[PDB]
Design a protein around this ligand. Sequence first.
Ligand code: NA
Lengths: 276, 100, 9
Amino acid sequence: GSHSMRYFHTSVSRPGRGEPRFITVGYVDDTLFVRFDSDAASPREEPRAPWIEQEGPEYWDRETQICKAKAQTDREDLRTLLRYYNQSEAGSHTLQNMYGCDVGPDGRLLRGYHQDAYDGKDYIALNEDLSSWTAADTAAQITQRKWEAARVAEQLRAYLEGECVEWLRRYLENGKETLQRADPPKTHVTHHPISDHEATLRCWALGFYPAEITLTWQRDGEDQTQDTELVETRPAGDRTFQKWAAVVVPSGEEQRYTCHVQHEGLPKPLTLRWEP
Amino acid sequence: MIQRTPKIQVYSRHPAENGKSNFLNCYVSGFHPSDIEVDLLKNGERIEKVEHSDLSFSKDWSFYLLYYTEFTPTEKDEYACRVNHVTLSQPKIVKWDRDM
Amino acid sequence: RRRWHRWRL
Ligand code: NA
């Protein structure tokens, strides 16, 4: 189907404790494929998926230099933001940046992105037009004026419509074993006595990829949204994800309850019940 | 500055079977700022050489990390995750429950 | 692959 590529970056200042810490990671869909951490002894961008390992030394050298450069420009930008917000040099602050692209099943650009946040709040974002900006406040408007003057959007647009999509397509091909495979959830229902009067029914979805999933409980066909404990989808640590949904059921009433699972890896939504 | 307290889940990679090697995970998410300290505990003591993912974030800019270690669950051994963050006056301890 | 970031806030 559709796919995405994202590069995420975080710099965190630490006054009196040297230069900011810089960490960046790249993803295709829900798959991590590259990482860089400035605090590694002689830091390099490193592979984190098998299908990127085949890129040659020139690729890793360029990537590494780009990461080092962004760490350095982030240091300058953190200093600028202290000025823009009239802040002291004593505190730790955070600068986050994301950029990348979404493509459709045919490989065509669906959306490009480039956006920044300061201290966990929106700062400036490239709009969906890839031609104009949304500034969150009067500080970000200063950046906007500079970036309008320098025709920054046009340069980002050229990357997002060109290289971003072209390299994503390359990765999807080289990684076709995994990036183009959905792993359906393995599902089951468990029963957890609370007392002689009631028990929890917990519906599990394990080992699925990608992360998007819907899990719901029904009682005689009616959705139990308000009475369901639904945990956040969580990584298993091996590429796949987990989720569960639980409801408290009076003794003897279990056969009224069905769990429903939707995942792109499932041809049709599944219906499960507790089987003693 | 607005701060967001971490969500915490402690769980295993595979369904727990006593005597069978597995991975113990502590997933912390939805937090800001990014500095956070996480320990995994076996019978109240810190497990050594725990690994973690590289810092990343969600669409809303909040951070997430996975801490993990190999472990072999038993009937009697108790595992937990201890999390400290600026939003917490006291570190939060979440016990591992093999049924969650 | 990445892009060089030339810009400053
Ligand atoms: Na921090």
